[PDB]
Curated annotation (Swiss-Prot), chain B:
GO terms for cellular component: mitochondrial inner membrane; respiratory chain complex I. GO terms for biological process: electron transport coupled proton transport; mitochondrial electron transport, NADH to ubiquinone; mitochondrial respiratory chain complex I assembly. It is a multi-pass membrane protein. The chain holds residues 1 to 331 of 606 of the full protein. Disulfide bonds: none annotated. Keywords: Electron transport, Membrane, Mitochondrion, Mitochondrion inner membrane, NAD, Respiratory chain, Translocase, Transmembrane, Transmembrane helix, Transport, Ubiquinone. Belongs to the complex I subunit 5 family. The gene is MT-ND5. This is NADH-ubiquinone oxidoreductase chain 5.
UniProtKB/Swiss-Prot annotation, chain D:
It comes from the Eukaryota. It catalyses: a ubiquinone + NADH + 5 H(+)(in) = a ubiquinol + NAD(+) + 4 H(+)(out). This is NADH-ubiquinone oxidoreductase chain 4. The keyword Membrane applies. The chain crosses the membrane at residues 22-42, 60-80, 98-118, 147-167, 193-213, 224-244, 257-277, 284-303, 308-330, 351-371, 391-413, 435-455. One of its GO terms (cellular component) is mitochondrial inner membrane. Its EC number is 7.1.1.2. Pfam families: Oxidored_q5_N, Proton_antipo_M. GO terms for biological process: aerobic respiration; electron transport coupled proton transport; mitochondrial electron transport, NADH to ubiquinone; mitochondrial respiratory chain complex I assembly. It is a multi-pass membrane protein.
Length: 32, 331, 120, 459, 63, 57, 99, 173, 64
């Protein structure tokens, strides 16, 4: 239901994992 | 023996009977609010005889019926102080809550839990009577805290409303700040006078120092919503109008100034604490009266008026007029 | 300590001077715990062997019990004799060396000054 | 004590030899019967202790604790049998066996006349407790919780073992009575300072002392409900009871050795009460509140007054009952929504009215509302601390304020407000759950009528 | 909730009513002991140092 | 009815009661080896009643 | 499939098959008897009879005896001019001070 | 009554006889007549019945007599039996002392309530007696701690006596 | 679930000892402890000095 990839992770260093974090939290990347 | 003691006790015991009956069968029917209002009226009528005996000859007594425990050299017992303050305040409070219950039978008629509302009113009345008649500091604390929790439950009567719960917790918070001073005074009196009963406390404190009196003043400022711990009383208007009229305007909120009146022999002998309570009452009455003249909610205006009157009671305590303050409570 | 004790003949579980002590009682709590250990061994034997642990092989569980009690009785005798020997030697040594074990001069608390430490 | 110990031991053969469906019935019936028998230990003497044999004795400190343990066993059984309904017969019998073993170890721990026997029995309680937590806990975090609880306790306890055998070699006895009657003042030296630390640190970590408490949230949260019940109710009290026993050989070194611990607990009660204001896990909030009450018990034992010891005894009893009640109340909601998050299920008073009443009673007792025995203990400790130093009233008043705030905050968030819209599986409270709360709350209030039964031997 | 409350009240009263009735009957018809000086030469039984007949029965029966 | 099943099923109910009586009996025996000061304390010692031989058991 | 594992089953409602469920057991008869034994042995016996047993426990701490002794001592001390209590807990004749 | 008048004194009770200076009836007297009719007489009858039952089932209990044993000053160091008996005697004596102080505080409280507005002057004797008994109790049992004993109490007394003797010797000079 | 995990279990995996965290830990963990120790120790030393010279009156302090 909620996999390991859906949980909070470490601080995003590069903008691709920052966009992935925005996607994980149901936000726009420019808002995250 | 003397009917004064039996009648003063019986006035208190009759209050608790509808509480024990609050699980029998009448509590499930629509006769419960009238039943509890009737026992309150009967308790008022009974309490007049002790008042009349005091009026005639000044009959006063302390009753220590049940020994609870002894702590080495400290005996803790159920002791009731049936003095002028008790035997005068009991009929007044019983009359007022009689009127409030009759009012609630009309105002809260459509409340689906009106029986529980009336039961809560009786519980608050019982705790306030315990507060007022208590002859030692532990029993007084029982009355104090039971009054506080009854106020919490009646302010948040409509518990699906966020503001009501916030107001109830706010009342608890400010009164806990006051309870710090109450417990301070309890600890000091145990440590220095080896007693929580009023007789030995008055005996061993011909010159009462600052710390216990400042603790008592903190407790009083908490309960009577003095400046600094004032805001909870106008926010207590979240309760139903009978709750406001009974607890937070006429009976419950005068507990602090009543606490200070109960220790007036000690406050009499300390000018510094007297000045402190005098000034606190002055600022409370001025500030709260200033707030009221611009309020648009009628209940808020009357709550700020009640705070102003409590400040005036603090003022008359602070000028060494405790009996004047008691008279003003009753009026 | 006890290895080089005089008269201590080799490979002798109970020496003959042990027959002067009272033998342990049959309902001795330690002996009963020995029997309980045997009973637990029988239950665990049933469990490991995949038999009904309570009702399988009553002769085997019984033998576990009696052999455990049998060894425990002699173990108790040897233990008690060793402690009796220990006390025997201790009293003999205190007797032979009075200078090492003086008679302490007893005094009452009315003449002894103990320091009072307040709790406050 | 054999008329108590042997019936408890007989619970194991009875549990293992009973039908698969009579397990809970039999265990509950006969554990309640044993608890009835344990009440006769409350007949105590003013001066002496009840010295039955060479190996077991009872006084006014240990008798209420024994009654609390024997009472906790049946309530445990009622709390467990819901979440263990789908388990196998053998595994249910193993869980019951663990609970019985824990009760038997606790019973002998509180009556052991000798310090080393007390040590072994108090260490033995680890094994069934650890088994319960790690085998029957629900989350993957139960394993780390078990490791934390085990190794915190053992790092505390092993130096105590060394100190106890040293004391036996130098004094000649570890017998409690002999230790009291032959008490020597403890001089001021590094040797004695470290002997004091060794004698104290195991009970410190058990209570737990603030700063040594990080195992407790893990263990009390991850454990199954019965495990949390015992851990909060009786296992924390092992540190206080042992500290009360062993402080009779630590004077006057306790006068200044207690300053770091007094400071730690006086500030950490504030710290952990504040933590409760922000806990998002209900079980974690209930676990964190135990640290503050136990900090009060720590202060009371460290200041060494008759009033402080009376208050500490009463507070231990009252906290046991109240914390177990709160854990059970949280578990009833957990078994419905399968989550410990506190704001998940809101507005529960309009769905479970009598359970909301139970919640209000539990919150009021955690508030230390007078004349409850919670308040009696707290007030006695506060008065003793005020005598110790007047400035203690600032911190203790702050703590009771914050305690009120978080207790009523938990009540308001779980019971009040609007119910959650999508949670449509809040079934009516079972008779079993209501009876569990009633059997938690009724003896708590009855104790107010006879408070001397829990005021310890200094009453 | 109603069924639980009814059952709890029933099981409290099931022994409470007989207990209360028996305590009242004992108090009314037996009553408490009267203090007296120990008669010359007589050594009292240990339960004879307590006043309430129920307390005396407990002391005699269980201790 | 069905006495065999009842006594083969609920027989475990005797275990805790008889363990209680055995505990009481073992408590009784423990006092028998702690009588070195029976009727000998400076507080309680007294002469025995004419048919009395011990003061507690 | 990542492994062969059973799906998480749904929780069973004790009320669905037994509206009269007391919450103890899925079988109505043992559930009823579990409720009965719990209530009887807990409330009827341990609570009521236990509270009564504790209430009527013979004198605890010998408080009545202590009060009677104090009354006799107060009567004797006052009737003879003796102080009600001496500061010295022990007689200074059986104490030998060092110097 | 059961309590002895000497241990629990009370001044001779002095009530003014009724001196009506009015013609309006006194409501209190009629409310007391109704009390005596509906309340006092039935409970008084219910008490004669009950004390009549108790009179025909008369039985006794006794005060427990402890003889004196040597105290902790007579105990040889580490003589466990003598220390046990002395320590039990000391704890009993401590409880009796607590009850003595309780009696005196009872007297003080009763006087404060009884004397009304004149308590400050009229209760000097009880305040003095409380001062004396509380000082003696403080000297005996204060600062011993939770783990008190006859040994610690005796050590405190010896510290007090050494201080007293040294103070006397230095005052003599 | 993300909110409750971030507030409990994600914190130590993402904590680093930096000057800010170390300064704050020392100030808030150790600062109040020594502050209160100084306050209480000063108060109790003053009390004990008063007791030694008998300048503190305890006329009716028989309960402690
Ligand atoms: C002279 C000095 C003073 C001396 C005496 C001092 C006494 C205490 C004074 C201080 C009290 C301050 C606080 C007052 C209460 C404030 C909260 C409140 O009102 O809650 C109402 C609430 C129940 O009423 P409700 O909310 O309308 O019920 C809704 C139900 O969902 C649905 O209910 P329903 O409509 O179906 O009707 C059933 C209802 C019937 O009951 C009621 O309707 C309420 C009864 C209230 C009794 C009086 C208040 C409590 C006093 C003792 C506590 O019962 C229940 O629901 C189950 C309750 C089972 C347990 C009851 C409590 C223990 C036994 C009774 C003790 C008395 O909870 C309680 O009554 C529990 C109060 C617990 C307080 C905390 C503990 C403090 C320390 C107590 C020591 C007591 C020692 C002596 C007694 C020992 C008994 C074993
Ligand atoms: C609650 C109920 C608990 C169980 C009660 C069991 C029965 C209690 C009563 C009893 O055994 O004897 C009663 C009673 C006492 O016998 P006694 O020989 O006078 O004295 C016995 C000893 O004192 C020796 O008395 P005792 O030491 O046996 O004490 C009896 C009782 C004493 O207590 C009571 O009886 C109940 C409480 C009485 C309260 C009295 C007024 C207190 C005022 C407090 C003020 C508070 C204000 C603020 C609120 O206490 C107990 O039973 C203790 C054990 C309780 C175990 C459970 C504890 C938790 C209970 C929780 C609630 C359930 O027997 C009578 O025959 C009484 C007659 C009363 C007459 C009244 C006027 C009659 C007028 C009409 C006359 C018509 C004919 C002529 C025309
Ligand atoms: C669980 C708690 C108890 C733990 C220990 C349990 C031990 C159980 C088995 C004990 C067997 C007997 C022990 C002694 C032994 O082996 O021999 C005794 C011995 C047998 O010969 P032994 O002494 O050579 O055997 C033991 C070996 N040494 C020498 C190291 C002690 O009894 C004697 O009397 C011989 C003495 C002279 C030896 C030359
Ligand atoms: C209240 C209204 C009046 C009631 C009647 C008047 C008498 C009265 O109140 O007596 C009260 C009495 C004491 O008050 P009392 O001294 O007035 O009693 C009168 C009887 N005589 C005169 C003989 C003393 O106390 C009780 O009845 C309360 C009992 C409390 C203990 C109950 C133990 C139950 C254990 C169950 C298991 C749970 C254990 C949990 C852990 C416990 C650890 C210790
Ligand atoms: C009007 C009456 C109102 C109610 C009154 C109170 C009733 C309370 C309920 C009964 C008592 C509850 C507590 C019992 C505690 C268990 C007994 C005990 O302490 O030890 C066993 C006790 C004491 O140990 P024992 O078995 O070695 O017997 C020794 C007896 N003396 C001390 C007198 C020499 O057993 C007995 O006293 C034997 C007879 C009773 C056997 C059953 C006891 C348990 C059940 C009761
Ligand atoms: C016993 C006596 C032993 C003496 C001989 C050994 C001395 C040297 C010990 C070196 C230990 C090195 C520890 C690791 C390290 O350097 O940093 C790890 C860590 C940093 O590791 P990190 O940066 O990887 O942390 C990552 C955190 N997460 C997982 C959330 C991402 O150190 C610290 O955080 C602080 C270290 C010092 C703190 C104080 C410790 C002692 C306190 C007093 C104890 C009682 C006295
Ligand atoms: C001298 C005295 C000075 C003043 C002391 C008290 C300071 C704090 C007073 C407010 C406490 C909280 C309160 O009652 O209300 C604040 C808040 C919302 O309340 P309100 O704004 O009325 O809501 C309107 C809704 N329409 O409601 C809340 O925030 C309550 C929920 C959070 C409670 C925990 C956090 C605060 C707790 C400590 C507050 C400060 C206490 C200081 C005590 C000092 C003592 C010397
Ligand atoms: C709060 C209560 C504690 C703080 C005040 C305590 C009293 C104090 O500071 O000085 C009082 C002291 C004389 O009395 P004291 O020493 O207290 O007596 C002890 C028993 N013998 O010394 C004196 O009386 C000296 C002259 C007065 C000194 C100032 C007294 C305090 C005035 C300000 C108090 C403000 C309290 C505010 C509390 C807010 C809580 C929310
Ligand atoms: C912790 C306890 C500490 C004290 C005791 C020490 C351990 C003693 C037992 C050691 C383990 C043995 C059994 C191992 C096990 O786990 O067995 C599992 C089994 C489960 O059931 P199952 O295998 O179906 O049973 C087959 C029929 N028995 O289990 C069982 O069937 C039963 C498991 C418990 C063993 C039986 C206990 C009661 C037996 C009757 C009373 C015995 C009293 C002693 C005297 C006996 C006289 C005949
Ligand atoms: C995460 C940690 C978890 C917990 C870890 C374990 C607990 C904490 C550490 C325990 C061990 C502490 C040992 C202290 C030994 C003190 C020995 C000593 O000398 O004591 C006597 C001294 C007397 O001082 P004096 O001025 O002479 O008194 C007046 C008369 N002249 O008086 C004193 O010295 C009193 C004590 C002073 C030092 C401590 C004061 C408290 C400060 C807060 C400590 C908090 C603990 C952590 C500290 C980390 C750094």
């Amino acid at each position: 239901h909620v996999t390991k990839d859906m949980f909070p992770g470490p601080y995003p260093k590069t903008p691709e994992e920052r966009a992935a974090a925005a996607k994980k939290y149901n936000m726009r990347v420019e808002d995250y | 023996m003397n009917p004064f003691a039996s009648l003063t006790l019986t006035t208190l015991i009759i209050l608790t009977i509808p509480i024990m009956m609050s699980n029998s069968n009448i509590y499930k029917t629509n006769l419960y609010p009238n039943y509890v209002k009737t026992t309150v009226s009967y308790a008022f009528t009974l309490s007049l005889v002790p008042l009349l005996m005091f009026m005639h000859t000044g009959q006063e007594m302390i009753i220590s019926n049940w020994h609870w425990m002894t702590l080495q050299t400290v005996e803790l017992s159920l002791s009731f102080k049936m003095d002028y303050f008790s035997v005068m305040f009991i009929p007044v409070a019983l009359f007022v809550t009689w009127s409030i219950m009759e009012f609630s039978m009309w105002y809260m008629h459509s409340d689906p839990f009106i029986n529980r509302f009336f039961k809560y009113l009786v519980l608050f009345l019982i705790t306030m009577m315990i507060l007022v008649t208590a002859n030692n500091l532990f029993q007084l604390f029982i009355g104090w805290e039971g009054v506080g929790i009854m106020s919490f439950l009646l302010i948040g009567w409509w518990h699906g409303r966020t503001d009501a719960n916030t107001a109830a917790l706010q009342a608890i918070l400010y009164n806990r700040i006051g309870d710090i001073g109450f417990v301070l005074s309890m600890a000091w009196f145990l440590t220095h006078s080896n007693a929580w009963d009023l007789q030995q406390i008055f005996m061993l404190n011909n010159e009462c120092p600052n710390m216990p009196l400042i603790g008592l003043l903190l407790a009083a400022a908490g309960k009577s919503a003095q400046f600094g711990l004032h805001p909870w009383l106008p926010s207590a208007m979240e309760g139903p109008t009978p709750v406001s009229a009974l607890l937070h305007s006429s009976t419950m909120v005068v507990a602090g100034v009543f606490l200070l009146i109960r220790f007036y022999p000690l406050m009499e002998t300390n000018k510094l604490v007297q000045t402190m309570t005098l000034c606190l009452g002055a600022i409370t009455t001025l500030f709260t009266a200033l707030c009221a003249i611009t309020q648009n909610d009628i209940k808020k205006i009357v709550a700020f008026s009640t705070s102003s009157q409590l400040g005036l009671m603090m003022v008359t305590i602070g000028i060494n007029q405790p009996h004047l303050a008691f008279l003003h409570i009753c009026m | 300590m006890m290895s080089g004790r005089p008269g201590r003949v080799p490979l002798q579980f109970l020496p003959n001077e042990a027959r002067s002590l009272p033998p342990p009682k049959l309902t001795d709590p330690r002996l009963v715990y020995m029997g309980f250990l045997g009973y637990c061994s029988g239950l665990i034997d049933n469990a490991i062997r995949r038999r009904p642990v309570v009702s399988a092989g009553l002769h085997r569980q019984l033998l576990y019990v009696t052999s455990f009690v049998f060894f425990g009785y002699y173990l108790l005798k040897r233990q008690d004799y060793m402690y009796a020997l220990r006390d025997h030697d201790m009293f003999a040594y205190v007797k032979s060396h009075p200078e090492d074990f003086p008679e302490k001069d007893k005094k009452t608390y009315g003449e002894i000054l103990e320091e009072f430490h307040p709790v406050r | 004590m054999l008329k108590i110990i042997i019936p408890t031991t007989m619970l194991l053969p009875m549990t293992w030899m009973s039908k698969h469906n009579m397990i809970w019935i039999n265990a509950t019936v006969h554990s309640l019967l044993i608890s009835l028998i344990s009440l006769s230990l409350l007949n105590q003497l003013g001066e002496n202790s009840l010295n039955f044999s060479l190996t077991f004795f009872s006084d006014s400190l240990s008798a209420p604790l024994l009654v609390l343990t024997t009472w906790l066993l049946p309530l445990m059984l009622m709390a467990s049998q819901s979440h263990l309904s789908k388990e196998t017969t053998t595994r249910k019998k193993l869980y019951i066996t663990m609970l019985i073993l824990l009760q038997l170890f606790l019973i002998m721990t509180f009556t052991a006349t000798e310090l080393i026997l007390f040590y072994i029995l108090f260490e033995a309680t680890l094994v069934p407790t650890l088994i319960i937590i790690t085998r029957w806990g629900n989350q993957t975090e139960r394993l780390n919780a078990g490791l934390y609880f085990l190794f915190y306790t053992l790092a505390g306890s092993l130096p105590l073992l060394v100190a106890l055998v040293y004391i036996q070699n130098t004094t000649g006895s570890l017998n409690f009575l002999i230790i009291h009657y032959w008490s020597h003042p403890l001089s001021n030296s590094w040797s004695n300072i470290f002997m004091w630390l060794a004698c104290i640190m195991a009970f410190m970590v058990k209570m737990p002392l603030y700063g040594l408490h990080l195992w407790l949230p893990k263990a009390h949260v991850e454990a199954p409900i019965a495990g949390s019940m015992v851990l909060a109710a009786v296992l924390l009290k092992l540190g206080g009871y042992g500290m009360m026993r062993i402080t009779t050989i630590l004077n006057p070194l306790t006068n200044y050795m207690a300053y770091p611990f007094l400071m730690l607990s006086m500030w950490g009660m504030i710290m952990t009460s504040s933590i409760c204001l922000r806990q998002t896990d209900l079980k974690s909030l209930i676990a964190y509140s135990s640290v503050s009450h136990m900090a009060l018990v720590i202060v009371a034992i460290m200041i060494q007054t008759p009033w402080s010891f009376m208050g500490a005894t009463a507070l231990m009893i009252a906290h046991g009952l109240t914390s177990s009640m709160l854990f059970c109340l949280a578990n009833t909601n957990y078994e419905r929504v399968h989550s410990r998050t506190m704001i998940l299920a809101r507005g529960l008073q309009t769905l479970l009215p009598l359970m909301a009443t139970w919640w209000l009673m539990a919150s009021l007792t955690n508030l230390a509302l007078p004349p409850s025995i919670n308040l009696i203990g707290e007030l006695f400790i506060i008065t003793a601390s005020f005598s110790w130093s007047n400035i203690t009233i600032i911190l203790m008043g702050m703590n009771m304020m914050i305690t009120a705030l978080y207790s009523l905050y938990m009540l308001i968030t779980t019971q009040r407000g609007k119910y959650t819209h999508h949670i449509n599986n809040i079934k009516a409270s079972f008779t079993r759950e209501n009876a569990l709360m009633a059997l938690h709350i009724l003896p708590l209030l009855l104790l107010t009528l006879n408070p001397k039964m829990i005021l310890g031997p200094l009453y | 909730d109603r069924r639980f409350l009814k059952l709890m009240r029933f099981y409290i009263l099931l022994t409470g009513i007989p207990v209360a009735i028996g305590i009242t009957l004992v108090n009314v018809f037996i009553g408490e002991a009267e203090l007296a000086d120990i008669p010359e030469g007589y050594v009292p039984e240990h339960w004879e140092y307590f006043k309430h007949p129920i307390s005396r029965w407990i002391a005699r029966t269980f201790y | 009815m069905n006495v065999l099943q009842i006594v083969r099923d609920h027989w475990v109910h005797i275990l805790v009661p008889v363990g209680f009586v055995f505990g009481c009996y073992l408590d009784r025996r423990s006092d028998e080896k702690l009588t070195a000061f029976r009727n000998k304390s400076l507080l309680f010692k007294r002469e025995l009643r004419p048919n009395e031989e011990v003061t507690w058991k | 499939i990542r492994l062969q594992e059973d799906p998480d089953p749904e929780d069973e409602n004790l009320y669905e098959k037994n509206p009269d469920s007391h919450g103890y057991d899925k079988d109505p008869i043992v559930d009823l008897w579990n409720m009965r034994v719990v209530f009887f042995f807990g409330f009827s016996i341990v609570l009521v009879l236990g509270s009564t047993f504790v209430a009527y426990l013979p004198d605890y701490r010998m408080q009545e005896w202590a009060r009677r002794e104090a009354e006799r001592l107060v009567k004797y001390r006052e009737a003879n001019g003796l102080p009600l209590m001496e500061s010295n807990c022990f007689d200074p004749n059986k104490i030998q001070l060092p110097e | 009554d059961s309590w002895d008048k000497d241990v629990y004194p009370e001044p001779p009770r002095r009530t003014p006889a009724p001196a009506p200076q009015t013609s309006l009836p006194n409501p209190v007297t009629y409310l007391t007549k109704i009390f005596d009719l509906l309340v006092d007489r039935p409970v008084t009858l219910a008490r004669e019945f009950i004390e009549q039952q108790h009179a025909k089932n008369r039985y006794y209990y006794y005060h427990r007599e402890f003889r004196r044993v040597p105290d902790i000053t007579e105990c040889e160091e580490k003589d466990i039996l003598c220390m046990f008996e002395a320590e039990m005697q000391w704890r009993r004596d401590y409880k009796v002392d607590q009850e003595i102080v309780n009696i005196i505080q009872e007297r003080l409280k009763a006087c404060q309530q009884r004397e009304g507005e004149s308590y400050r002057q009229n209760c000097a004797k009880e305040l003095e007696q409380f001062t004396q008994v509380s000082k003696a109790f403080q000297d005996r049992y204060s600062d011993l701690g939770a783990h008190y004993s006859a040994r610690k109490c005796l050590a405190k007394q010896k510290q007090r006596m050494l201080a007293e003797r040294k103070a006397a010797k230095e005052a003599a000079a | 679930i993300r909110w409750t995990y971030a507030r409990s279990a994600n914190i130590y995996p993402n904590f680093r000892p930096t000057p800010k965290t170390s300064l704050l830990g020392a100030l808030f963990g150790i600062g109040p402890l020594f502050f209160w120790y100084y306050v209480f120790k000063t108060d109790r030393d003053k009390k004990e000095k008063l007791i030694q010279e008998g300048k503190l009156d305890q006329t009716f302090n028989i309960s402690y």
